Write a protein that binds this ligand. Structure first.
Ligand SMILES: OC[C@H]1O[C@H](O)[C@H](O)[C@@H](O)[C@@H]1O
Ligand SMILES: [Ca+2]
Length: 556
């Protein structure tokens, strides 16, 4: 039995808001995405995941949805969504949409009804509780600042919001609510959608009675919110009432969950989700407060990958990504975005990304080696989470505005959201108007038109790696083995299938390094290298590596 198409595919994530504008309002749209499908096809992309594209007041850029069955006004009409689908299908490409059902907009008609009275039939579509001892029902905090509880004077109770005030949590404990969600999913799957990605999938079940978080839990609240006791019962039911009747792949954003629980979401025998996005790697260097960085080494990086791979085992399956719309840019985060090293390290990270056991997701603009943005003031951020940090840390006197700026510049989601850099015309060819978020000035050196025409570019290297992955089954579905998990200079591992073995070797230092193959192993062939003056000789038992050198080798 061949493995399903999604185990061997290469995905690309599109953040439609920041991808391509076609009417000069400074916001990307569907017509912009549709016009650029030949660009993604030519790169070799099999499937696209688009961030939320539904009716939204955009307090959280699409993740506050006010109608699940209509398209966002800024992106276009249902006709434009249908045309997008038809053009993907022409190119043999698939669509994964984002599914945001932990919470809705406070502007959704369900919520406008829910708020009206305790006896409203929509009351229990959300969570409403009396406050305690003069204040909120409990001490839950929100990821976006202040309490996770908001008082509504219309009834005098509080409603739950893990995310923003304008994102009330949906009440999965209510059967009528679940049934409404399942019908909504069927609405999109009936249109032929090939995949669904579940935003914060691990927080759907709430703790009965909502007791206070202990001081430990408080310091790690993201984790406590993943511990609802009905979580897997809900996911199994969603599979039985929705996914079982379609041919779609399902991927969960398992944010906050302890790694050893991940198998419950993805083990195929459990009939929950097909694949996981986990955050142990991408947050391995993030403080608990989410706005400081802690220094880590390559040893921490590879050890995390190893543990994550082990949790997928025989019946589970992982995605692999180094960036998304909620994190800093891959090259700035994991490589070295200084001008002399940006290109060399962007290539090394590509090699890593495209040779992991798992379905790779390439975040828009990483194929160009786009970097973090040079924020100068707090006013340069759009992000609602940065306003939250301002509220929780600056106004309470815990940190100065400057301490916030300096640290959040490195970590903020807005680093990923600056407009895609198409060429060196005005605003990098993203828009003819004023972009909703400023273009990085480095667009003059980093842009698609320049990259595409250059066979030594980062783009070209990504295109070649993708082609090599497509051609070499061991690189998608073969086993993974880290050759030396404690080495903090040179990342090396094998991928193996049906007697064939490939060796990947990646120098994480901006300094020359040596690598000795394990005993009995010799180089048979060189598939590709980055930043290398010469391939090893057939039979080679060791390698000399330039700074940031990467390579893939068939081994014997
Ligand atoms: O808690 C899940 C979500 O919370 C916030 O949005 C985080 O910034 C983001 O990483 C994640 O998608
Ligand atoms: Ca537009």
């Amino acid at each position: 039995p061949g493995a399903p198409w999604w185990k061997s595919a290469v995905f690309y994530q599109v953040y439609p808001r920041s991808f391509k504008d076609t009417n000069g309002d400074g916001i990307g749209d569907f017509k912009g995405l549709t016009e650029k499908l030949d660009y993604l096809k030519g790169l070799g992309i099999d499937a696209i995941w688009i961030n939320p594209h539904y009716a939204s007041p955009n307090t959280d850029n699409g993740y506050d949805i006010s109608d699940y069955r209509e398209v966002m006004k800024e992106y276009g009409t249902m006709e434009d969504f249908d045309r997008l689908m038809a053009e993907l299908k022409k190119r043999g490409m698939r669509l994964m949409v984002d599914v945001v059902i932990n919470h809705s907009s406070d502007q959704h008609e369900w919520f406008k009804s829910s708020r009206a009275s305790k006896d409203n039939p929509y009351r229990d579509y959300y969570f409403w509780r009396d406050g305690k001892d003069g204040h909120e029902p409990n001490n839950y905090p929100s990821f976006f600042g202040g309490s996770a509880w908001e008082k509504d004077p219309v009834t005098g109770q509080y409603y739950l919001h893990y995310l923003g005030r304008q994102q009330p949590d949906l009440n999965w404990d209510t059967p009528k609510l679940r049934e409404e969600l399942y019908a909504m999913l069927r609405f999109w799957l009936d249109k032929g959608v090939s995949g669904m990605r579940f935003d914060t999938v691990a927080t759907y079940s709430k703790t009965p009675g909502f007791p206070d978080l202990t001081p430990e839990q408080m310091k790690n609240f993201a984790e406590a919110y993943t511990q609802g006791p009905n979580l897997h019962r809900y996911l199994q039911e969603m599979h039985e009432k929705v996914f079982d009747h379609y041919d779609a792949v399902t991927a969960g954003e398992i944010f906050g969950a302890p790694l050893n629980q991940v198998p419950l979401f993805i083990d195929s025998r459990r009939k929950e989700l097909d694949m996981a996005f986990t955050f142990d790697l991408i947050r391995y260097d993030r403080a608990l407060d989410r706005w400081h960085t802690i220094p880590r080494t390559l040893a921490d990086f590879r050890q995390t990958i190893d543990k994550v791979d082990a949790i997928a085992g025989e019946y589970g399956w992982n995605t692999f990504f180094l960036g998304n719309h909620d994190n800093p840019r891959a090259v700035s985060h994991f490589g070295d975005d200084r001008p002399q090293w940006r290109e060399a390290s962007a290539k090394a990270l590509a090699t890593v990304t495209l040779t992991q056991r798992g379905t790779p997701f390439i975040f828009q603009g990483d194929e160009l080696g786009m970097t973090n943005y040079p924020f100068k003031t707090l006013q340069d951020f759009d992000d609602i989470e940065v306003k939250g940090f301002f509220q929780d840390y600056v106004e309470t006197g815990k940190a100065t505005a400057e301490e916030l700026l300096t640290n959040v510049a490195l970590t903020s989601r807005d680093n990923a959201r600056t407009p895609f850099q198409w060429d060196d015309s005005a605003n990098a060819g993203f828009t003819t108007g004023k972009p909703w978020l400023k273009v990085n000035p480095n667009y003059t050196e980093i842009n698609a038109a320049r990259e595409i025409g250059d066979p030594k570019s980062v783009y070209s290297f990504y295109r070649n790696l993708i082609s090599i992955r497509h051609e070499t089954p061991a690189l998608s579905t073969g086993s993974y083995r880290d050759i030396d998990p404690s080495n903090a200079d040179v990342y090396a591992y094998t991928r193996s299938q049906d007697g064939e073995t490939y060796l990947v070797v990646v120098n994480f230092k901006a300094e020359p390094r040596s690598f000795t193959l394990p005993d009995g192993m010799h180089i048979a062939e060189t598939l590709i290298e980055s930043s290398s003056p010469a391939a090893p000789a057939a039979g080679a038992a060791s390698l000399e590596l330039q700074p940031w050198q990467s390579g893939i080798y068939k081994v014997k």
